[PDB]
Amino acid sequence: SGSGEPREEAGALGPAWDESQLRSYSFPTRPIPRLSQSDPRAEELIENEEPVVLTDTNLVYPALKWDLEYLQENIGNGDFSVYSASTHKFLYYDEKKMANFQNFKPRSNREEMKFHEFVEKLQDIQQRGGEERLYLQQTLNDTVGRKIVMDFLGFNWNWINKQQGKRGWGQLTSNLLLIGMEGNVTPAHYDEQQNFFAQIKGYKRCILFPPDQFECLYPYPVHHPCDRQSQVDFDNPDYERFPNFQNVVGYETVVGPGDVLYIPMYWWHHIESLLNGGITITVNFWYKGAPTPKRIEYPLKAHQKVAIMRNIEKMLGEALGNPQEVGPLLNTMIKGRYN
Amino acid sequence: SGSGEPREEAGALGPAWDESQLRSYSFPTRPIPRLSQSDPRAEELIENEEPVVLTDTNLVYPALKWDLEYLQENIGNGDFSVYSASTHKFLYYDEKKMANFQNFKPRSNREEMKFHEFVEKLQDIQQRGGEERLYLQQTLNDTVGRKIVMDFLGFNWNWINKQQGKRGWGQLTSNLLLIGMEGNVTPAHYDEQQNFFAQIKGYKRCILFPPDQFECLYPYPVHHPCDRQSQVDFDNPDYERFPNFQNVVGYETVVGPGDVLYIPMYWWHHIESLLNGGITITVNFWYKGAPTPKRIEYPLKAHQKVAIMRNIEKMLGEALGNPQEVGPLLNTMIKGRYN
Ligand SMILES: CN(C)NC(=O)CCC(=O)O
Ligand SMILES: CN(C)NC(=O)CCC(=O)O
Ligand SMILES: [Zn+2]
Ligand SMILES: [Zn+2]
């Protein structure tokens, strides 16, 4: 199923989106349940760290009116982080980690600019028929226009705050504002925080994979710049290197204006902006997860095992004095002994 | 080379031992240097944690006179740990670790007895032509006959103590008394302590492999009862499972009455009692190695890397709550990511 049968906009405006807009992949997916926030099922899902789309939080209600003209006019003047890509797949690398891998070259460069500048480039490419794609990802801080700040004050903080309280998560780390061109893709990867993905303008197709599918997704070495990202190219999966990618099953859904997707921590997610569907705008909120209990309980959850693996890689890297030696030692350790 | 050309006993008593007495193996070996304790080269070797045979310490001079009759008469009455084997290869397992692996069966059982009892069994088998082989391994404590205690007091403690002092090792953990039948084999493995192997009666062929040959020797999982032992059968090496066993190079030597073999910590050693060479007697002394420095220094030594691997296996086993899950997690961790 996945996104399944497209929702119909009220007033007979027709199907919000349709199939030809989604990209094609090798794996099967099932739908993430779209529920009402009042629905006890949703709170259960969140409590159990399973994804769910909430259709009625009103979380970013004030922002549903945002668009580029509005944002330009009222977002004020400040530098916005903007990324560029040669193709539809945006490549993110952690700059602090580049020292560890010399044979790494940036394929998706960051550029700091002013909203009007980013808007100019966007409009320009549209007219100039450029190959290029752009993505604006900027954390929001109190430097924004008065109107935007008022809009922010209008968010349903009461609801997001209650969620944080009930589940015992840590304080709200931050929120990021995301504006991207249609067809843009943020390749599968996972975060270690609990995320609330609130859609504002346009539709984004969100594909999630649970933590227990770690074997099928082949993340980069922890010391690699692309740590937490899948090495597998969903457009041309290499089965010889990533054999278990053939056993992967995603959870799929398409979020639109007013929807909030709870992405549990450690859950893989692949996100794409619908083809020919125009510009997209999202505001993502995230919380550090609740801290681990004193005496752990078995069976362990899959994400704890993932945490365990991450930790061994980090320590091994620190102990040897080089991250490059991690793989060789681990192989020496496994070969003919555990495999 | 290895043992090379057999030493000649004084008074033209002829060759102490000869080739037909050594077992046949697939790998090449070179000789461990036999030096005088006065030789500065020996102290250098020991300082550098490289094996060496000292021909003149007089370490167990008083014991050179030991034999079974003498030991029976004077060793007093106490229980001695004695192991039995179906074949020439003695199998040692760590009993505390058996809970972790159910599909493990003892193939070399321990039996507590009295010296005269062990001597009886030995003599009996000799007459009865038994298939069986026996090995007496007992730590020595002040329960021994007065004569034996006097003999002990006669050891060149001054020399062994000076060795311990100069090198910064910890206190002498203990010493073990080893009496075995000719042809007996203690399969390759390593200890984490610094050992001084002092030969008393008979000849033992000692084959050592440095720590850096860990990949070629394939030790059992740390949680396995046979932890620290090579999984490879030197009599029938399985190259499909242990491919790098074909790259293994040992250091060889045959120790006789009066010789002391320094076996550095973490160094693999394979020890056999010469065929048809009669009974063997050895006293092994060991020290915990010097403690690790505050700020480590790179490059790391091979034994530190081995220590690192051991530690990761232990921790992983404790973290998961089962030692059986170690291998699966490590594979998940390596596959398509580091290999
Ligand atoms: C932080 N994470 C949940 N958020 C994302 O990955 C957003 C990616 C995007 O929407 O393109
Ligand atoms: C403790 N280790 C050095 N000693 C041994 O392995 C003795 C084995 C034996 O000589 O059979
Ligand atoms: Zn993410
Ligand atoms: Zn040993």
Side-chain angles (χ1 to χ4, degrees), chain B residues 92 135 137 178 186 189 191 195 197 204 263 269 271 282 284 286:
Chain B
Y92 302 86
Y135 221 143
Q137 296 171 13
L178 309 121
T186 298
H189 64 288
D191 302 292
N195 294 262
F197 203 73
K204 268 186 176 181
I263 304 180
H269 45 276
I271 293 157
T282 324
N284 185 62
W286 69 69

Side-chain angles (χ1 to χ4, degrees), chain A residues 135 186 189 191 195 197 204 263 269 271 284:
Chain A
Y135 221 143
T186 298
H189 64 288
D191 302 292
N195 294 262
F197 203 73
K204 268 186 176 181
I263 304 180
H269 45 276
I271 293 157
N284 185 62

Side-chain angles (χ1 to χ4, degrees), chain A residues 2-4 6-14:
Chain A
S3 47
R7 288 207 168 238
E8 283 263 21
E9 311 183 306
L13 293 196

Side-chain angles (χ1 to χ4, degrees), chain A residues 83-90 92-102 104 106 108-120 122 124-125 129-130 133-141 143-145 147-165 167-170 172-287 289-296 298-336:
Chain A
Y83 302 83
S84 53
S86 304
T87 77
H88 63 288
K89 273 160 323 207
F90 271 68
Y92 302 86
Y93 51 85
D94 164 320
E95 296 180 353
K96 313 187 277 304
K97 282 172 168 166
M98 259 151 106
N100 315 332
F101 294 64
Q102 286 44 74
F104 188 54
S108 267
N109 292 49
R110 189 181 116 240
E111 199 144 12
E112 289 297 67
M113 73 186 61
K114 260 72 187 149
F115 208 90
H116 70 100
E117 311 209 63
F118 156 58
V119 202
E120 293 190 60
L122 218 52
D124 163 359
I125 275 116
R133 311 242 198 180
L134 262 72
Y135 221 143
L136 174 150
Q137 296 171 13
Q138 185 54 51
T139 289
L140 246 25
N141 76 127
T143 138
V144 290
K147 265 187 198 178
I148 297 314
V149 165
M150 230 64 335
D151 283 343
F152 229 81
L153 284 167
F155 288 6
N156 190 343
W157 296 111
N158 189 54
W159 180 90
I160 203 166
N161 287 345
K162 233 154 76 225
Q163 276 323 303
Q164 164 205 298
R167 343 243 85 110
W169 298 346
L172 140 31
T173 297
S174 73
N175 59 44
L176 192 103
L177 165 68
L178 309 121
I179 309 192
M181 311 189 31
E182 66 194 336
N184 279 12
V185 189
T186 298
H189 64 288
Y190 69 97
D191 302 292
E192 320 187 35
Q193 312 91 35
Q194 307 278 13
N195 294 262
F196 272 123
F197 203 73
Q199 197 60 1
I200 283 143
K201 184 192 180 41
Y203 303 82
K204 268 186 176 181
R205 183 207 187 165
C206 301
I207 331 193
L208 281 49
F209 304 93
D212 75 17
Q213 286 195 49
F214 181 99
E215 299 100 283
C216 311
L217 289 152
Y218 304 88
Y220 286 85
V222 152
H223 298 279
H224 190 282
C226 299
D227 168 34
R228 293 185 292 109
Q229 298 167 49
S230 182
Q231 295 183 78
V232 189
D233 173 327
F234 285 34
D235 297 326
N236 195 29
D238 185 322
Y239 297 114
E240 302 190 297
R241 307 185 48 192
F242 316 113
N244 286 115
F245 192 55
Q246 285 176 306
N247 300 119
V248 97
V249 192
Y251 287 45
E252 168 168 24
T253 204
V254 174
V255 293
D259 296 316
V260 183
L261 166 57
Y262 165 49
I263 304 180
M265 55 170 350
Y266 283 101
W267 274 64
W268 295 80
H269 45 276
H270 165 88
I271 293 157
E272 52 189 52
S273 287
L274 299 210
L275 302 146
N276 292 296
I279 292 295
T280 47
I281 293 149
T282 324
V283 172
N284 185 62
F285 303 92
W286 69 69
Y287 296 91
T292 8
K294 71 156 341 287
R295 287 275 119 143
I296 247 354
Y298 298 82
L300 290 170
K301 296 162 180 189
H303 70 81
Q304 304 181 279
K305 290 188 198 206
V306 177
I308 284 176
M309 282 183 286
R310 292 188 56 78
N311 188 45
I312 283 163
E313 297 178 58
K314 281 158 165 181
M315 294 182 333
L316 188 48
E318 173 205 349
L320 295 180
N322 166 55
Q324 314 268 87
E325 250 198 278
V326 173
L329 198 68
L330 290 172
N331 276 122
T332 291
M333 198 177 161
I334 277 124
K335 283 167 80 183

Side-chain angles (χ1 to χ4, degrees), chain B residues 176-287 289-296 298:
Chain B
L176 192 103
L177 165 68
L178 309 121
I179 309 192
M181 311 189 31
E182 66 194 336
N184 279 12
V185 189
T186 298
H189 64 288
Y190 69 97
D191 302 292
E192 320 187 35
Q193 312 91 35
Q194 307 278 13
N195 294 262
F196 272 123
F197 203 73
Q199 197 60 1
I200 283 143
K201 184 192 180 41
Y203 303 82
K204 268 186 176 181
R205 183 207 187 165
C206 301
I207 331 193
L208 281 49
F209 304 93
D212 75 17
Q213 286 195 49
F214 181 99
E215 299 100 283
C216 311
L217 289 152
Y218 304 88
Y220 286 85
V222 152
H223 298 279
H224 190 282
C226 299
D227 168 34
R228 293 185 292 109
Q229 298 167 49
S230 182
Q231 295 183 78
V232 189
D233 173 327
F234 285 34
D235 297 326
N236 195 29
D238 185 322
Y239 297 114
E240 302 190 297
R241 307 185 48 192
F242 316 113
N244 286 115
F245 192 55
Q246 285 176 306
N247 300 119
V248 97
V249 192
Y251 287 45
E252 168 168 24
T253 204
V254 174
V255 293
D259 296 316
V260 183
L261 166 57
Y262 165 49
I263 304 180
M265 55 170 350
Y266 283 101
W267 274 64
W268 295 80
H269 45 276
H270 165 88
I271 293 157
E272 52 189 52
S273 287
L274 299 210
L275 302 146
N276 292 296
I279 292 295
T280 47
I281 293 149
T282 324
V283 172
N284 185 62
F285 303 92
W286 69 69
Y287 296 91
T292 8
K294 71 156 341 287
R295 287 275 119 143
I296 247 354
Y298 298 82

